[PDB]
Amino acid sequence: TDDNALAYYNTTKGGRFVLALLSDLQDLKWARFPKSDGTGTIYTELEPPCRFKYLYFIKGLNNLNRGMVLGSLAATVR
Amino acid sequence: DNALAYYNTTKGGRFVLALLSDLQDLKWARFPKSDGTGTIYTELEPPCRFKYLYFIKGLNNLNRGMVLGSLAAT
Amino acid sequence: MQVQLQESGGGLVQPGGSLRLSCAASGLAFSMYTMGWFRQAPGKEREFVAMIISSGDSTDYADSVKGRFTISRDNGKNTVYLQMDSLKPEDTAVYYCAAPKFRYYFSTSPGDFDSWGQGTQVTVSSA
Amino acid sequence: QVQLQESGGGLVQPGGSLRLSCAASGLAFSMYTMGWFRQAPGKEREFVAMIISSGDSTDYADSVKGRFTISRDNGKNTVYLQMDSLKPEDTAVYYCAAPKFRYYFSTSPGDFDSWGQGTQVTVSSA
Amino acid sequence: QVQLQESGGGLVQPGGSLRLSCAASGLAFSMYTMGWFRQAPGKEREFVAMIISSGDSTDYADSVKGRFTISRDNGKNTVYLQMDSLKPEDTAVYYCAAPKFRYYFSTSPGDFDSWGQGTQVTVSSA
Amino acid sequence: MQVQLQESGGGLVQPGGSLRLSCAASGLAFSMYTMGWFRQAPGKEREFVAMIISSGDSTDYADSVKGRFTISRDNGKNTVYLQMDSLKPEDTAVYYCAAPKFRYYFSTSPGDFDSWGQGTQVTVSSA
Structure with a gap:
């Protein structure tokens, strides 16, 4: 199946960036996102995984929390 | 590599980033820098059919923050 | 339509005892x-206790309650429950059931919620 | 332990419409x-409409047949009452009713104990 | 340890063409x-063109779209810039740029440290 | 386009030690x-040391270095390497990487080459 968009890509037709999680275990249910301001963490439920090697799509992404999960990942790489 | 950020839980987990469109001829994706200091290009991978989904290559410690900051502006 | 949350089950109990909180959620695709x-204990900030996924078959707990509390839900009645065993005095607080703004998501930050019930008091004491 | 919150009422003009809502809390809806x-002023509560558990069959008092439409959302545990072509006679307090057992209903106000607070519906010139 | 030798520049007349070359040494090209x-005189280096690793997709600044053509030879580890319909505005020093990691590019001159010596391109009447 | 060869890796080392020469070749279908x-040792003529086939999986060495030197290449980076172990003083020389005029061919005669780099010095001594 398909999930929702992290951000929209203004270049292609009906183009969206999707965010997925890769892990070695196939039982995962939620993903964790420490917030950038350290006030807590954001949990997003995942889809049923795929095997390629286990890949989970995110279902909790909204037009709005998108910024908080984007902001979280940015703090993680730094 | 395709890692947008590293998951610190177990089994070496990473968040991957994919771009989806109606097309299958795509080869790269653009990410304008939020500062306006230019654009980052990263090559895509062979798409998968289920629309068309293309994983992203070219993610490194030098551009992860800029691509994240590019999608944050979006 | 507005989301309403009706919490119950609190009370006065002695250390080592148990209690069972309930929350009936009105007005949302539960x-x-x-x-x-x-x-939220007196004089302390409101903290996360536990959470349960939409489907009911996976959970998460704050470390301070792991092994003693059990969260569960009933999708037919739109109710959430908190089974609290082996109660300690530091468990004294007003307990709040929380419903997030969006579907398939949760935050451990109480600032990210705006549908709060009135809460239900839990007192763990000698009396 | 079974709570009913009703809403959607108001004051409208004859021929207008309204949509009442009732979110039910605490039952295997x-x-x-x-x-x-x-329940008009003074008069006793009367049956309006009913809808079976699954949502796909209904029954109405004859005074509202063809004008009202009852529906439900088993997800939100809510039932709705769409009111069209309103008449002054329609003025009354509206109540959402949940019976004491499953898969059954009664048009007797006396057979109920789960009553909401109601929502006022006033159909008049103002 | 990564070296870039550029060539192909010169002085031509508006409307003429040129073909720049850069042979890259010391990287998994x-x-x-x-x-x-x-980089014109005084002004800061600007992006011209880019071509992905496999050689079959490209992108150009808008000022050179339709006139320039970038290509590559993964055999000789060389990239090329065919310049047609040259304008005086095109006068500048041209640089071949190799990024610090694979499968990615940036149009920001600051994100690069592998810079050739350049090749002068002068488009004028003489 | 002209072929350019950038040699490196030489230095001063003591007998029995090792070194590793590298050559980056620009401008040819490597x-x-x-x-x-x-x-080319001081006062001696330039001599063949080793060679490697285009595909990288067969080699040849002068007798004086057999068993001690290893030549290898990397077709992606267009680089050739010379691993020199068990160095002796007679190994002192300027080392030159060589690219022949044509493809799929090599000569042991330095007169048959015209693309010479600057070379890199190897000194095998007590200091």
Whole structure:
């Protein structure tokens, strides 16, 4: 199946960036996102995984929390 | 590599980033820098059919923050 | 339509005892929400206690209650529950059931919620 | 332990419409036949409409047949009452009613104990 | 340890063409997106063109679209810039740019440290 | 386009030690050439040291270095390497990477080459 968009890509037709999680275990249910301001963490439920090697799509992404999960990942790489 | 950020839980987990469109001829994706200091290009991978989904290559410690900051502006 | 949360089950109990909180949620597509509980002890900030996924078959707990509390839900009645065993005095607080703004998501930050019930008091004491 | 919050009422002009809502809290909603009652001033509560648990069959008082439409959302545990072509006679307090057992309903106001607070519906010139 | 030798520049007349070359030494060339930058007198280096590792997709600044053509030879580890319909505005020093990691490019001159010596391109009446 | 060869890796080392020469070749369809190394000791003529086939999986060495030197290449980076172990003083020379004029061919005669780099010095001594 398909999930929702992290951000929209203004270049292609009906183009969206999707965010997925890769892990070695196939039982995962939620993903964790420490917030950038350290006030807590954001949990997003995942889809049923795929095997390629286990890949989970995110279902909790909204037009709005998108910024908080984007902001979280940015703090993680730094 | 395709890692947008590293998951610190177990089994070496990473968040991957994919771009989806109606097309299958795509080869790269653009990410304008939020500062306006230019654009980052990263090559895509062979798409998968289920629309068309293309994983992203070219993610490194030098551009992860800029691509994240590019999608944050979006 | 507005979301309403009716919490109950609190009371006065002695250390080592148990209690069972309940929350009836009105006005939301309940089975698509991750639900959870927070608590606010006197003079302390409101903290996360536990959470349960929309489907009911996976959970998460604050470390301070792991092994003693059990969160569960009933998707037909739109109710969430918190089974609290082996109660300690530091468990004294007002307990709040929490419903997030969006579906399939939860935050451990009480600032990210705006549908708060009135809460239900839990007192763990000698009396 | 079973709570009913009703809303949607107001003051409208004859011929207008309204949509009442009732969110039910604390019961295995999708196994209950739900329905609505109304109570003009002084007169006793009367049956309006009922809808079976699954949501795909209904029954109406004859005074509202063809004008009202009852529906339900087993997801949100809510039942609705769409009111069209309103008449002054329709003025009354509207109540959402949940019976004491599953898969059954009664048009007797006396057979109920789960009553909401109601929502006022006033159909008049103002 | 990564060296870039550029060539092909010169002085031509508006409307003429030129073909720049850059042979790259010391990198797994076929895994890099390569591209070209240019720097007029005084002004800061600007992006010209880029071509992905495999050689079959490209992108150009808008001022050179339709006139320039970038290509590559993964055999000789060389990238090329065919310049047609030259304008005086095109005068500048041209630089071949190799990024610090594979499969990615940036149009920001600051994100590069592998810079050739350049090749002068002068488009004028003489 | 002209072929350019950038040699490196030489230095001063003591007998029995090792070194590793590198050569980055610019401007030629590298994977179709047999590449090799020569060396020219002070006052002696330039002599063949080793060679490697285009594909990288067969080699040849002068007798004086057999068993001690290893030539290898990397067709992606267009680089040739010379691993020199068990160095002796007679190994002192300027080392030159060599690219022949045509593809799939090599000569042990330094007169048959015209693309010579600047070389890199190897000194095998007590200091």
